[PDB]
Amino acid sequence: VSVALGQTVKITCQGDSLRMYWYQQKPAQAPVLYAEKNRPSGIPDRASLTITGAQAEDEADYYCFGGGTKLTVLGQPKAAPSVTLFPPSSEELQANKATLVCLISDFYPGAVTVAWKADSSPVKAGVETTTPSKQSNNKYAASSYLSLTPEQWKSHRSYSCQVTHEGSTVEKTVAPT
Amino acid sequence: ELTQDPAVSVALGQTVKITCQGDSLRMYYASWYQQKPAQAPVLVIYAEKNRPSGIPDRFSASSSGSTASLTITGAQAEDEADYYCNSRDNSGDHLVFGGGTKLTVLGQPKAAPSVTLFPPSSEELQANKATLVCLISDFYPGAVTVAWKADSSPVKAGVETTTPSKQSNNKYAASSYLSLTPEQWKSHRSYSCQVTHEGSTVEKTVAPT
């Protein structure tokens, strides 16, 4: 969930007990403070939460308990990820190893979801994905990798890496030889 | 309205006690949350005595007066996180939270990084691109220095390296990539990725085929 500076956002909470009947948590900080119509005090003033005037400091997790909503305050333009799926190299295959690397770069905001496929079959066994971190251009980079045996690599028609980034999905597919 | 030290350390397999202090703790039992970077908080203990399903038996909680404590016996590598206490706050149906305590688990087994260097893929060369990727995995502690080479010449421009993050095995992973044009890739005899991890340096080399 992202918003531009000075723009309007809506964070939504879904589940039971909402038919019958606010905490802000910045990274490595305590979730600080009621129910739809209430007047709090201590932090600057103005189920779903709406923020009319958004500042870079407002970038935090909001909780109604909900799973958590990472509100991103756009400090720069949105950028879809550049996705490159690298197949196992000849050198790695000659060493009886196979690793596929899905390189994800130049994206903003810094949140992605990665899914893998063996042919048309979704796979998650042997998958590791790194936490996005800032490049020198202030955009983000991450990598997801899938460890396979060379027999698994050669016995499949293809392998795919799918990257989801705020309503955009980029899938890259590679095939042996 | 609850106080706890910002950080604490323990040795692997040893016991750690994280304490919270506040007037509300004399009236209410504390709940404990575990939070790792880029992850949703996990309820580790509910109102001192309830351990939810999925939470290891290593976690327990106790209290005395205006203090509440979370005890981790036989602290594991997966237990490194920020631990926050929470409770109700006297006259008023609202919750108060502690500032959080970051836990460091010392004496964890060290590991040299596994380094895999990929040449440009056939799809990116067909698209007039020649980015190389250097996968750095299964290392501990989570700090590396990455340097690239064009034959024997060090490369500064076009290099990006990710901050190491934990894998599901509690070892770290990172990647470094070098953006090149097919021209730069084909003109050199080889390119290298050298990774420095404490007393170890691992370098891999790829060549155009």
PDB file of all heavy atoms in Angstrom, chain B residues 19-50:
ATOM      1  N   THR B  19      12.726  -8.407  30.446  1.00  0.00           N
ATOM      2  CA  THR B  19      11.771  -7.852  31.402  1.00  0.00           C
ATOM      3  C   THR B  19      11.192  -6.510  30.980  1.00  0.00           C
ATOM      4  O   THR B  19      11.901  -5.676  30.413  1.00  0.00           O
ATOM      5  CB  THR B  19      12.367  -7.764  32.827  1.00  0.00           C
ATOM      6  OG1 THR B  19      13.100  -6.549  32.980  1.00  0.00           O
ATOM      7  CG2 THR B  19      13.239  -8.961  33.196  1.00  0.00           C
ATOM      8  N   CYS B  20       9.915  -6.294  31.322  1.00  0.00           N
ATOM      9  CA  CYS B  20       9.155  -5.068  31.101  1.00  0.00           C
ATOM     10  C   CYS B  20       8.695  -4.523  32.431  1.00  0.00           C
ATOM     11  O   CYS B  20       8.387  -5.309  33.322  1.00  0.00           O
ATOM     12  CB  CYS B  20       7.975  -5.318  30.173  1.00  0.00           C
ATOM     13  SG  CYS B  20       8.366  -5.071  28.432  1.00  0.00           S
ATOM     14  N   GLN B  21       8.626  -3.190  32.565  1.00  0.00           N
ATOM     15  CA  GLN B  21       8.212  -2.538  33.809  1.00  0.00           C
ATOM     16  C   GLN B  21       7.168  -1.441  33.577  1.00  0.00           C
ATOM     17  O   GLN B  21       7.353  -0.576  32.718  1.00  0.00           O
ATOM     18  CB  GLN B  21       9.439  -1.999  34.569  1.00  0.00           C
ATOM     19  CG  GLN B  21       9.151  -1.630  36.031  1.00  0.00           C
ATOM     20  CD  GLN B  21      10.387  -1.485  36.889  1.00  0.00           C
ATOM     21  OE1 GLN B  21      11.452  -1.026  36.448  1.00  0.00           O
ATOM     22  NE2 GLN B  21      10.256  -1.836  38.161  1.00  0.00           N
ATOM     23  N   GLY B  22       6.098  -1.485  34.368  1.00  0.00           N
ATOM     24  CA  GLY B  22       5.003  -0.525  34.303  1.00  0.00           C
ATOM     25  C   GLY B  22       3.919  -0.769  35.333  1.00  0.00           C
ATOM     26  O   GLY B  22       3.673  -1.916  35.716  1.00  0.00           O
ATOM     27  N   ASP B  23       3.254   0.320  35.773  1.00  0.00           N
ATOM     28  CA  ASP B  23       2.170   0.300  36.764  1.00  0.00           C
ATOM     29  C   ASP B  23       0.984  -0.583  36.357  1.00  0.00           C
ATOM     30  O   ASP B  23       0.367  -1.203  37.225  1.00  0.00           O
ATOM     31  CB  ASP B  23       1.700   1.726  37.091  1.00  0.00           C
ATOM     32  CG  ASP B  23       2.729   2.574  37.814  1.00  0.00           C
ATOM     33  OD1 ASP B  23       3.387   2.051  38.744  1.00  0.00           O
ATOM     34  OD2 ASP B  23       2.848   3.773  37.480  1.00  0.00           O
ATOM     35  N   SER B  24       0.697  -0.668  35.036  1.00  0.00           N
ATOM     36  CA  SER B  24      -0.381  -1.489  34.475  1.00  0.00           C
ATOM     37  C   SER B  24      -0.141  -2.986  34.671  1.00  0.00           C
ATOM     38  O   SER B  24      -1.105  -3.749  34.679  1.00  0.00           O
ATOM     39  CB  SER B  24      -0.587  -1.174  32.996  1.00  0.00           C
ATOM     40  OG  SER B  24       0.518  -1.581  32.205  1.00  0.00           O
ATOM     41  N   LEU B  25       1.130  -3.401  34.858  1.00  0.00           N
ATOM     42  CA  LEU B  25       1.524  -4.805  35.062  1.00  0.00           C
ATOM     43  C   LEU B  25       1.130  -5.361  36.430  1.00  0.00           C
ATOM     44  O   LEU B  25       1.177  -6.574  36.629  1.00  0.00           O
ATOM     45  CB  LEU B  25       3.023  -5.034  34.789  1.00  0.00           C
ATOM     46  CG  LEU B  25       3.534  -4.747  33.366  1.00  0.00           C
ATOM     47  CD1 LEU B  25       5.013  -4.983  33.271  1.00  0.00           C
ATOM     48  CD2 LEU B  25       2.828  -5.591  32.318  1.00  0.00           C
ATOM     49  N   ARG B  26       0.737  -4.484  37.364  1.00  0.00           N
ATOM     50  CA  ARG B  26       0.269  -4.866  38.698  1.00  0.00           C
ATOM     51  C   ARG B  26      -1.172  -5.353  38.590  1.00  0.00           C
ATOM     52  O   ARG B  26      -1.637  -6.108  39.446  1.00  0.00           O
ATOM     53  CB  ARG B  26       0.295  -3.660  39.649  1.00  0.00           C
ATOM     54  CG  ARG B  26       1.679  -3.147  40.006  1.00  0.00           C
ATOM     55  CD  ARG B  26       1.588  -2.003  40.998  1.00  0.00           C
ATOM     56  NE  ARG B  26       2.829  -1.230  41.056  1.00  0.00           N
ATOM     57  CZ  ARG B  26       3.852  -1.503  41.861  1.00  0.00           C
ATOM     58  NH1 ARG B  26       3.800  -2.540  42.687  1.00  0.00           N
ATOM     59  NH2 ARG B  26       4.940  -0.745  41.837  1.00  0.00           N
ATOM     60  N   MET B  27      -1.878  -4.890  37.545  1.00  0.00           N
ATOM     61  CA  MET B  27      -3.289  -5.160  37.288  1.00  0.00           C
ATOM     62  C   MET B  27      -3.504  -6.115  36.132  1.00  0.00           C
ATOM     63  O   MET B  27      -4.507  -6.827  36.122  1.00  0.00           O
ATOM     64  CB  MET B  27      -4.029  -3.846  36.965  1.00  0.00           C
ATOM     65  CG  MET B  27      -3.880  -2.765  38.020  1.00  0.00           C
ATOM     66  SD  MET B  27      -5.138  -2.842  39.308  1.00  0.00           S
ATOM     67  CE  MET B  27      -6.561  -2.165  38.421  1.00  0.00           C
ATOM     68  N   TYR B  28      -2.612  -6.080  35.125  1.00  0.00           N
ATOM     69  CA  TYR B  28      -2.769  -6.877  33.915  1.00  0.00           C
ATOM     70  C   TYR B  28      -1.556  -7.715  33.532  1.00  0.00           C
ATOM     71  O   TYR B  28      -0.411  -7.311  33.736  1.00  0.00           O
ATOM     72  CB  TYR B  28      -3.195  -5.975  32.735  1.00  0.00           C
ATOM     73  CG  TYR B  28      -4.426  -5.141  33.024  1.00  0.00           C
ATOM     74  CD1 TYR B  28      -4.325  -3.775  33.267  1.00  0.00           C
ATOM     75  CD2 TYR B  28      -5.691  -5.723  33.083  1.00  0.00           C
ATOM     76  CE1 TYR B  28      -5.453  -3.003  33.548  1.00  0.00           C
ATOM     77  CE2 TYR B  28      -6.827  -4.962  33.364  1.00  0.00           C
ATOM     78  CZ  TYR B  28      -6.704  -3.601  33.591  1.00  0.00           C
ATOM     79  OH  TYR B  28      -7.817  -2.842  33.867  1.00  0.00           O
ATOM     80  N   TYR B  29      -1.834  -8.899  32.966  1.00  0.00           N
ATOM     81  CA  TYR B  29      -0.833  -9.827  32.476  1.00  0.00           C
ATOM     82  C   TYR B  29      -0.321  -9.309  31.143  1.00  0.00           C
ATOM     83  O   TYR B  29      -1.087  -8.730  30.370  1.00  0.00           O
ATOM     84  CB  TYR B  29      -1.424 -11.232  32.302  1.00  0.00           C
ATOM     85  CG  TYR B  29      -1.673 -11.968  33.598  1.00  0.00           C
ATOM     86  CD1 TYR B  29      -2.963 -12.288  34.003  1.00  0.00           C
ATOM     87  CD2 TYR B  29      -0.615 -12.382  34.404  1.00  0.00           C
ATOM     88  CE1 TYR B  29      -3.200 -12.979  35.191  1.00  0.00           C
ATOM     89  CE2 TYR B  29      -0.842 -13.053  35.607  1.00  0.00           C
ATOM     90  CZ  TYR B  29      -2.135 -13.370  35.984  1.00  0.00           C
ATOM     91  OH  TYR B  29      -2.371 -14.068  37.139  1.00  0.00           O
ATOM     92  N   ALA B  30       0.973  -9.504  30.882  1.00  0.00           N
ATOM     93  CA  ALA B  30       1.575  -9.047  29.643  1.00  0.00           C
ATOM     94  C   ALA B  30       1.560 -10.086  28.541  1.00  0.00           C
ATOM     95  O   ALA B  30       1.766 -11.274  28.795  1.00  0.00           O
ATOM     96  CB  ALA B  30       3.000  -8.578  29.888  1.00  0.00           C
ATOM     97  N   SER B  31       1.345  -9.624  27.307  1.00  0.00           N
ATOM     98  CA  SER B  31       1.467 -10.445  26.105  1.00  0.00           C
ATOM     99  C   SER B  31       2.819 -10.098  25.481  1.00  0.00           C
ATOM    100  O   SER B  31       3.325  -8.990  25.685  1.00  0.00           O
ATOM    101  CB  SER B  31       0.325 -10.186  25.128  1.00  0.00           C
ATOM    102  OG  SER B  31      -0.855 -10.827  25.583  1.00  0.00           O
ATOM    103  N   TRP B  32       3.420 -11.045  24.766  1.00  0.00           N
ATOM    104  CA  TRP B  32       4.729 -10.846  24.152  1.00  0.00           C
ATOM    105  C   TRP B  32       4.712 -11.101  22.650  1.00  0.00           C
ATOM    106  O   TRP B  32       4.212 -12.134  22.194  1.00  0.00           O
ATOM    107  CB  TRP B  32       5.782 -11.707  24.854  1.00  0.00           C
ATOM    108  CG  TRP B  32       6.008 -11.313  26.286  1.00  0.00           C
ATOM    109  CD1 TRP B  32       5.310 -11.745  27.377  1.00  0.00           C
ATOM    110  CD2 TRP B  32       6.984 -10.385  26.774  1.00  0.00           C
ATOM    111  NE1 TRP B  32       5.808 -11.159  28.519  1.00  0.00           N
ATOM    112  CE2 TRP B  32       6.830 -10.311  28.177  1.00  0.00           C
ATOM    113  CE3 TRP B  32       7.992  -9.613  26.158  1.00  0.00           C
ATOM    114  CZ2 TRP B  32       7.637  -9.495  28.976  1.00  0.00           C
ATOM    115  CZ3 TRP B  32       8.808  -8.826  26.954  1.00  0.00           C
ATOM    116  CH2 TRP B  32       8.628  -8.770  28.346  1.00  0.00           C
ATOM    117  N   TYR B  33       5.244 -10.130  21.883  1.00  0.00           N
ATOM    118  CA  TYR B  33       5.336 -10.196  20.429  1.00  0.00           C
ATOM    119  C   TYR B  33       6.775 -10.296  19.987  1.00  0.00           C
ATOM    120  O   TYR B  33       7.652  -9.664  20.579  1.00  0.00           O
ATOM    121  CB  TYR B  33       4.665  -8.970  19.777  1.00  0.00           C
ATOM    122  CG  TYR B  33       3.158  -9.052  19.783  1.00  0.00           C
ATOM    123  CD1 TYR B  33       2.417  -8.534  20.839  1.00  0.00           C
ATOM    124  CD2 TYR B  33       2.472  -9.682  18.750  1.00  0.00           C
ATOM    125  CE1 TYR B  33       1.029  -8.640  20.869  1.00  0.00           C
ATOM    126  CE2 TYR B  33       1.082  -9.781  18.760  1.00  0.00           C
ATOM    127  CZ  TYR B  33       0.363  -9.260  19.823  1.00  0.00           C
ATOM    128  OH  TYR B  33      -1.012  -9.349  19.831  1.00  0.00           O
ATOM    129  N   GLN B  34       7.013 -11.087  18.933  1.00  0.00           N
ATOM    130  CA  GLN B  34       8.321 -11.290  18.314  1.00  0.00           C
ATOM    131  C   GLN B  34       8.271 -10.693  16.923  1.00  0.00           C
ATOM    132  O   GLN B  34       7.383 -11.033  16.137  1.00  0.00           O
ATOM    133  CB  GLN B  34       8.652 -12.785  18.234  1.00  0.00           C
ATOM    134  CG  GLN B  34       9.928 -13.103  17.454  1.00  0.00           C
ATOM    135  CD  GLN B  34      10.085 -14.574  17.204  1.00  0.00           C
ATOM    136  OE1 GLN B  34      10.932 -15.235  17.803  1.00  0.00           O
ATOM    137  NE2 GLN B  34       9.265 -15.123  16.319  1.00  0.00           N
ATOM    138  N   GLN B  35       9.218  -9.808  16.612  1.00  0.00           N
ATOM    139  CA  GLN B  35       9.266  -9.203  15.295  1.00  0.00           C
ATOM    140  C   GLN B  35      10.659  -9.226  14.697  1.00  0.00           C
ATOM    141  O   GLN B  35      11.605  -8.717  15.298  1.00  0.00           O
ATOM    142  CB  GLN B  35       8.662  -7.795  15.278  1.00  0.00           C
ATOM    143  CG  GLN B  35       8.467  -7.279  13.847  1.00  0.00           C
ATOM    144  CD  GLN B  35       7.922  -5.882  13.752  1.00  0.00           C
ATOM    145  OE1 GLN B  35       8.210  -5.010  14.581  1.00  0.00           O
ATOM    146  NE2 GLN B  35       7.166  -5.630  12.692  1.00  0.00           N
ATOM    147  N   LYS B  36      10.767  -9.818  13.498  1.00  0.00           N
ATOM    148  CA  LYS B  36      11.996  -9.912  12.708  1.00  0.00           C
ATOM    149  C   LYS B  36      11.882  -8.871  11.595  1.00  0.00           C
ATOM    150  O   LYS B  36      10.749  -8.534  11.245  1.00  0.00           O
ATOM    151  CB  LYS B  36      12.142 -11.321  12.098  1.00  0.00           C
ATOM    152  CG  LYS B  36      12.324 -12.410  13.143  1.00  0.00           C
ATOM    153  CD  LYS B  36      12.436 -13.775  12.507  1.00  0.00           C
ATOM    154  CE  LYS B  36      12.387 -14.858  13.549  1.00  0.00           C
ATOM    155  NZ  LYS B  36      12.573 -16.202  12.954  1.00  0.00           N
ATOM    156  N   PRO B  37      12.999  -8.351  11.009  1.00  0.00           N
ATOM    157  CA  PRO B  37      12.864  -7.356   9.927  1.00  0.00           C
ATOM    158  C   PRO B  37      12.089  -7.891   8.729  1.00  0.00           C
ATOM    159  O   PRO B  37      12.164  -9.089   8.437  1.00  0.00           O
ATOM    160  CB  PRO B  37      14.314  -7.038   9.540  1.00  0.00           C
ATOM    161  CG  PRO B  37      15.132  -7.485  10.674  1.00  0.00           C
ATOM    162  CD  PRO B  37      14.421  -8.645  11.281  1.00  0.00           C
ATOM    163  N   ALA B  38      11.309  -7.005   8.074  1.00  0.00           N
ATOM    164  CA  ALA B  38      10.465  -7.286   6.902  1.00  0.00           C
ATOM    165  C   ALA B  38       9.476  -8.452   7.104  1.00  0.00           C
ATOM    166  O   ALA B  38       9.052  -9.086   6.132  1.00  0.00           O
ATOM    167  CB  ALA B  38      11.325  -7.500   5.655  1.00  0.00           C
ATOM    168  N   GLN B  39       9.094  -8.708   8.370  1.00  0.00           N
ATOM    169  CA  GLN B  39       8.151  -9.758   8.763  1.00  0.00           C
ATOM    170  C   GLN B  39       7.086  -9.213   9.716  1.00  0.00           C
ATOM    171  O   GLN B  39       7.353  -8.299  10.505  1.00  0.00           O
ATOM    172  CB  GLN B  39       8.882 -10.946   9.422  1.00  0.00           C
ATOM    173  CG  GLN B  39       9.715 -11.786   8.457  1.00  0.00           C
ATOM    174  CD  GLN B  39      10.206 -13.072   9.075  1.00  0.00           C
ATOM    175  OE1 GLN B  39       9.428 -13.908   9.544  1.00  0.00           O
ATOM    176  NE2 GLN B  39      11.506 -13.286   9.047  1.00  0.00           N
ATOM    177  N   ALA B  40       5.879  -9.789   9.638  1.00  0.00           N
ATOM    178  CA  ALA B  40       4.745  -9.449  10.499  1.00  0.00           C
ATOM    179  C   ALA B  40       5.058  -9.897  11.940  1.00  0.00           C
ATOM    180  O   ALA B  40       5.745 -10.911  12.111  1.00  0.00           O
ATOM    181  CB  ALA B  40       3.492 -10.156  10.001  1.00  0.00           C
ATOM    182  N   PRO B  41       4.592  -9.184  12.996  1.00  0.00           N
ATOM    183  CA  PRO B  41       4.864  -9.664  14.361  1.00  0.00           C
ATOM    184  C   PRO B  41       4.166 -10.990  14.651  1.00  0.00           C
ATOM    185  O   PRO B  41       3.121 -11.291  14.076  1.00  0.00           O
ATOM    186  CB  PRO B  41       4.354  -8.536  15.264  1.00  0.00           C
ATOM    187  CG  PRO B  41       4.038  -7.395  14.354  1.00  0.00           C
ATOM    188  CD  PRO B  41       3.742  -7.978  13.018  1.00  0.00           C
ATOM    189  N   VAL B  42       4.776 -11.794  15.522  1.00  0.00           N
ATOM    190  CA  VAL B  42       4.270 -13.102  15.919  1.00  0.00           C
ATOM    191  C   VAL B  42       3.939 -13.017  17.401  1.00  0.00           C
ATOM    192  O   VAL B  42       4.787 -12.597  18.187  1.00  0.00           O
ATOM    193  CB  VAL B  42       5.320 -14.221  15.626  1.00  0.00           C
ATOM    194  CG1 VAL B  42       4.830 -15.583  16.111  1.00  0.00           C
ATOM    195  CG2 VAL B  42       5.658 -14.293  14.140  1.00  0.00           C
ATOM    196  N   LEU B  43       2.716 -13.430  17.793  1.00  0.00           N
ATOM    197  CA  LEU B  43       2.340 -13.462  19.197  1.00  0.00           C
ATOM    198  C   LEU B  43       3.008 -14.705  19.794  1.00  0.00           C
ATOM    199  O   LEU B  43       2.679 -15.836  19.440  1.00  0.00           O
ATOM    200  CB  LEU B  43       0.808 -13.472  19.372  1.00  0.00           C
ATOM    201  CG  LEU B  43       0.266 -13.636  20.803  1.00  0.00           C
ATOM    202  CD1 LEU B  43       0.532 -12.405  21.649  1.00  0.00           C
ATOM    203  CD2 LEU B  43      -1.213 -13.902  20.776  1.00  0.00           C
ATOM    204  N   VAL B  44       3.989 -14.476  20.654  1.00  0.00           N
ATOM    205  CA  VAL B  44       4.786 -15.524  21.271  1.00  0.00           C
ATOM    206  C   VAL B  44       4.130 -16.017  22.579  1.00  0.00           C
ATOM    207  O   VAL B  44       4.076 -17.225  22.825  1.00  0.00           O
ATOM    208  CB  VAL B  44       6.253 -15.015  21.396  1.00  0.00           C
ATOM    209  CG1 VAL B  44       6.922 -15.444  22.681  1.00  0.00           C
ATOM    210  CG2 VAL B  44       7.071 -15.437  20.182  1.00  0.00           C
ATOM    211  N   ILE B  45       3.586 -15.094  23.379  1.00  0.00           N
ATOM    212  CA  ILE B  45       2.913 -15.429  24.638  1.00  0.00           C
ATOM    213  C   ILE B  45       1.686 -14.547  24.774  1.00  0.00           C
ATOM    214  O   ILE B  45       1.796 -13.330  24.624  1.00  0.00           O
ATOM    215  CB  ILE B  45       3.878 -15.245  25.865  1.00  0.00           C
ATOM    216  CG1 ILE B  45       5.048 -16.285  25.901  1.00  0.00           C
ATOM    217  CG2 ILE B  45       3.117 -15.223  27.185  1.00  0.00           C
ATOM    218  CD1 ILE B  45       4.693 -17.785  26.176  1.00  0.00           C
ATOM    219  N   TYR B  46       0.529 -15.150  25.085  1.00  0.00           N
ATOM    220  CA  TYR B  46      -0.689 -14.393  25.324  1.00  0.00           C
ATOM    221  C   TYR B  46      -0.959 -14.329  26.821  1.00  0.00           C
ATOM    222  O   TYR B  46      -1.084 -15.377  27.468  1.00  0.00           O
ATOM    223  CB  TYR B  46      -1.901 -14.978  24.578  1.00  0.00           C
ATOM    224  CG  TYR B  46      -3.208 -14.338  25.007  1.00  0.00           C
ATOM    225  CD1 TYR B  46      -3.458 -12.988  24.770  1.00  0.00           C
ATOM    226  CD2 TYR B  46      -4.177 -15.072  25.687  1.00  0.00           C
ATOM    227  CE1 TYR B  46      -4.639 -12.385  25.194  1.00  0.00           C
ATOM    228  CE2 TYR B  46      -5.369 -14.481  26.109  1.00  0.00           C
ATOM    229  CZ  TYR B  46      -5.594 -13.137  25.860  1.00  0.00           C
ATOM    230  OH  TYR B  46      -6.758 -12.538  26.259  1.00  0.00           O
ATOM    231  N   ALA B  47      -1.085 -13.093  27.362  1.00  0.00           N
ATOM    232  CA  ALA B  47      -1.393 -12.817  28.780  1.00  0.00           C
ATOM    233  C   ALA B  47      -0.636 -13.727  29.758  1.00  0.00           C
ATOM    234  O   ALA B  47      -1.235 -14.405  30.599  1.00  0.00           O
ATOM    235  CB  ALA B  47      -2.893 -12.878  29.019  1.00  0.00           C
ATOM    236  N   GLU B  48       0.698 -13.764  29.587  1.00  0.00           N
ATOM    237  CA  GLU B  48       1.684 -14.503  30.378  1.00  0.00           C
ATOM    238  C   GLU B  48       1.601 -16.054  30.312  1.00  0.00           C
ATOM    239  O   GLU B  48       2.632 -16.690  30.139  1.00  0.00           O
ATOM    240  CB  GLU B  48       1.666 -14.041  31.861  1.00  0.00           C
ATOM    241  CG  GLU B  48       2.677 -14.762  32.747  1.00  0.00           C
ATOM    242  CD  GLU B  48       2.549 -14.505  34.232  1.00  0.00           C
ATOM    243  OE1 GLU B  48       2.453 -13.321  34.622  1.00  0.00           O
ATOM    244  OE2 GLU B  48       2.579 -15.484  35.010  1.00  0.00           O
ATOM    245  N   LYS B  49       0.428 -16.652  30.537  1.00  0.00           N
ATOM    246  CA  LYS B  49       0.309 -18.104  30.704  1.00  0.00           C
ATOM    247  C   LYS B  49      -0.077 -18.909  29.469  1.00  0.00           C
ATOM    248  O   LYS B  49       0.058 -20.135  29.489  1.00  0.00           O
ATOM    249  CB  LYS B  49      -0.672 -18.401  31.848  1.00  0.00           C
ATOM    250  CG  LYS B  49      -0.206 -17.806  33.172  1.00  0.00           C
ATOM    251  CD  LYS B  49      -1.296 -17.728  34.211  1.00  0.00           C
ATOM    252  CE  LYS B  49      -0.749 -17.056  35.444  1.00  0.00           C
ATOM    253  NZ  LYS B  49      -1.679 -17.144  36.593  1.00  0.00           N
ATOM    254  N   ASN B  50      -0.531 -18.252  28.398  1.00  0.00           N
ATOM    255  CA  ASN B  50      -0.955 -18.966  27.201  1.00  0.00           C
ATOM    256  C   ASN B  50       0.089 -18.938  26.095  1.00  0.00           C
ATOM    257  O   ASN B  50       0.461 -17.869  25.634  1.00  0.00           O
ATOM    258  CB  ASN B  50      -2.320 -18.430  26.710  1.00  0.00           C
ATOM    259  CG  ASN B  50      -3.438 -18.494  27.730  1.00  0.00           C
ATOM    260  OD1 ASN B  50      -3.304 -19.056  28.822  1.00  0.00           O
ATOM    261  ND2 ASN B  50      -4.574 -17.908  27.396  1.00  0.00           N
TER     262      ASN B  50
END
